[PDB]
Write a protein that binds this ligand. Sequence first.
Ligand SMILES: Cc1ccnc2c1NC(=O)c1cccnc1N2C1CC1
Ligand SMILES: CCOC(=O)C1C(=O)N(O)c2ncccc2C1O
Ligand SMILES: [Mn+2]
Ligand SMILES: [Mn+2]
Lengths: 555, 400
Amino acid sequence: SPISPIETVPVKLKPGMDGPKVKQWPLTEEKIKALVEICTEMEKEGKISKIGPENPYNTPVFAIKSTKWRKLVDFRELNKRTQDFWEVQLGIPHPAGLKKNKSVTVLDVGDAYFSVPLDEDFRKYTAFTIPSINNETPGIRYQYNVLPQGWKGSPAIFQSSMTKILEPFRKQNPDIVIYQYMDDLYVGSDLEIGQHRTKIEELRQHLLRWGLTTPDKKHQKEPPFLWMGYELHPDKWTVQPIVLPEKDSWTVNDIQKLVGKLNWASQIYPGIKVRQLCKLLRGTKALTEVIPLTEEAELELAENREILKEPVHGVYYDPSKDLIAEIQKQGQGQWTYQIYQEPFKNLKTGKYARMRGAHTNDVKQLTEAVQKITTESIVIWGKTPKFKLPIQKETWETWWTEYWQATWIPEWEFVNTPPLVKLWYQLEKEPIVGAETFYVDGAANRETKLGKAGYVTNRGRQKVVTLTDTTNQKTELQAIYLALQDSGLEVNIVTDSQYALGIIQAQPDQSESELVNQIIEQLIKKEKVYLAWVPAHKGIGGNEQVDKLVSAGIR
Amino acid sequence: ETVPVKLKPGMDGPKVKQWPLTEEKIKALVEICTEMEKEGKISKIGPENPYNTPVFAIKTKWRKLVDFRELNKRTQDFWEVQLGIPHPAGLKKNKSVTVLDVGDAYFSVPLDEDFRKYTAFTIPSINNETPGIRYQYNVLPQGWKGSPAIFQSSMTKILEPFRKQNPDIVIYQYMDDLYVGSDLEIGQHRTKIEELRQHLLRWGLTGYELHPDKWTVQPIVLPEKDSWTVNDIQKLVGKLNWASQIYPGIKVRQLCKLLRGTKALTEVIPLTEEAELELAENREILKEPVHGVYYDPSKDLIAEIQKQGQGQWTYQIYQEPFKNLKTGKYARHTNDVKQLTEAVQKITTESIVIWGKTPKFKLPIQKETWETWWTEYWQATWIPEWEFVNTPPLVKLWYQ
Ligand SMILES: Cc1ccnc2c1NC(=O)c1cccnc1N2C1CC1
Ligand SMILES: CCOC(=O)C1C(=O)N(O)c2ncccc2C1O
Ligand SMILES: [Mn+2]
Ligand SMILES: [Mn+2]
């Protein structure tokens, strides 16, 4: 097993700290014997070398079980003391971003970490001791000359070395695509099943020249490749087999495992839903507690089963074509999407269902799903897709201009796939002449938690309800709600709550507050609503009236 | 020649993740970086360097912008209370101020050996197909605040004869930029700039034009109208009530006396005379600067920006809320983000001109949206600090 002629990577320890000095626990005789067999074998290969107790450092060893042993070194203390390293990656490729190729080959590196050397000045800190039968003799002491299993820096340095090894070959084979992943290499090209086989062996030679053994023609894996939960053919890809078990009883754990599988499947299976299954996990219980399935959850499971009926795959990326992203409202809070280049041959699918803030509408949700997909596309393809959205340009146009937040959807086009996205009500810009002007206000006593909500109008009317466990904010929303309840199809409402105005002004059509949803229910039933704000306690006609009317016995 | 630099005691170097970049920006950066490496400005690095600082490409020739905001915080003591560049109070009073990208100077000066590791940055690959290309600076980097602090003595030398020949010319160095301001006539000013570019050219360096004397306030204009309606006077008092929290002397009482008893909004009510007495006396106060508001150099600046629609944007600079150091506006294919990024830069330059630091921005935008799009329109050599916020729906109309 070759030990590679690479340059070395200068490793240090975390500033101020000295190397580990953890005592070796005495082991059993079969364990001590097994370690000697292993260590002397590694010694002859150059993997480890003998030292003496002049070297002050120690890391414990162990042996586990089969009819032969493996040696385990617990580098916990050295790992705590070794410097921080650059991350071994910033992200993992999505199959959907891979170019299509005629041939693709897997080469795993023979004995990964042990093939690459360790910095001389750090080798001393990897010292371990094989002890004698009891207290007895001083033990046999070794240090590593190669990257050790389970050591903090081995991942990064091995990967660093591999990049440097491939560099020349890459630059003299520009139309050859290679991907490093742990102790694997995936190599693809567009040349025929003849000179492609040739080109692998040129690479294998380049690797053996740098002390890395890779399987030959007869021993290398065949397509499709299982990788990180994918199946990868040279021209298509899909997620690995999803199987939703039919159970009499569903435990939290089962539902959790189901949701995870569905979430995973959703990368390529269109229309996957998980809201109803997820709902069950809220404010939960033990892993083993049986959750009775909700009717809507049962409906969701059946739908998902149906979608996963027959296998579906994804295609690979073509750099010469644009990307098309299509998005659909799947129900409440749920949004589903597909990305393709050629009509309906998907590169990948996906779902969005987030809840950005308490109160939202479909136009806000739709544009948030657009940003999520936009980021994703940059990561996977290095460009933004053309969007096709279930919303009218004018519906969108209207929302953007009037809204206080800045927004930007890249190039898109309307597509008539119901449900279509629309606003459900709109507040007037001008107060309605010949409509009843409600002045609303709330009040809440902070210690008691009691409150009053009410209104006085320009037409003499006057109501005041009492509420028991409340906050000022809730009372204002209640007061505004009252004004809508007893007003009919055309109303002016003046409030002194910016909080309240803020929520309503941004046309929400769903909330995490039941009260706010009641207000929405009322606002749609209306025909013309004007809402306006006045400052609290500045001698305003109707405002001072309701305030005194709700402040009766409360403040 | 390398002057020793180190971090502020206790804190360690930056570990900031790199943002996803588009195909073209990555390609642009690979070209930019292959060159800088040949010329020895930067060198490839190994995994032994755990540090990272984001990198972007901006604008006809693509150019590299490094986000050193994080590093700057962790070396603050160095560029501020060791080799701080003094700010001249005259710069804002000048009739014309030209801004010159002088940042190419820094490549001639080598960087402290032991410090080079903290300037680590990464060029990532599309779909993470290949490991990121890792680099570190061997010379003073652009966008790092330590750079002009170190270069200050070389800069003083370069500018010595020009300063001697033009005593009435204000030259302020902020970052990669030199702020040159004069009270001359425009033709003479633009000539003195070209004259200065020749001084710079003899050392290896290489315009954008401001008029800070013509930065009059944004007075909160109160409406004038014939036959006010109940609604209009309510909007009027709300604006005044708020204005009295900042401006001393703002009276409000007489207006509300006209609003007594539960009345309808559309009902037109006649205006008395005590209204116009207070109104005009209010207008009088709003058009002047804030009395009692002064800049504390040890307090962070904050800027708020409100979307106004019709391609309009109002903004306010302050350290303590409502205590406005300056208010303003911004006029307008042109989208929200494009305009917002342009406004931010405008406001930031004005801030640098007036106080010599960038304000922390409160941005009326979604985090993700801003992060994906801001580089498309960004043009400056610096990056200010930003937060993302909900513009109070009433702050909007107040400054409108
Ligand atoms: C796991 C993986 C991740 C990144 N890229 C690839 C692979 N492996 C493939 O199976 C593969 C298949 C299709 C296209 N490129 C692929 N490759 C490219 C390298 C030839
Ligand atoms: C904290 C109490 O202050 C008040 O006097 C206030 C009050 O009565 N009401 O109704 C009120 N209503 C909305 C906003 C703010 C206030 C107030 O400050
Ligand atoms: Mn109130
Ligand atoms: Mn009140």
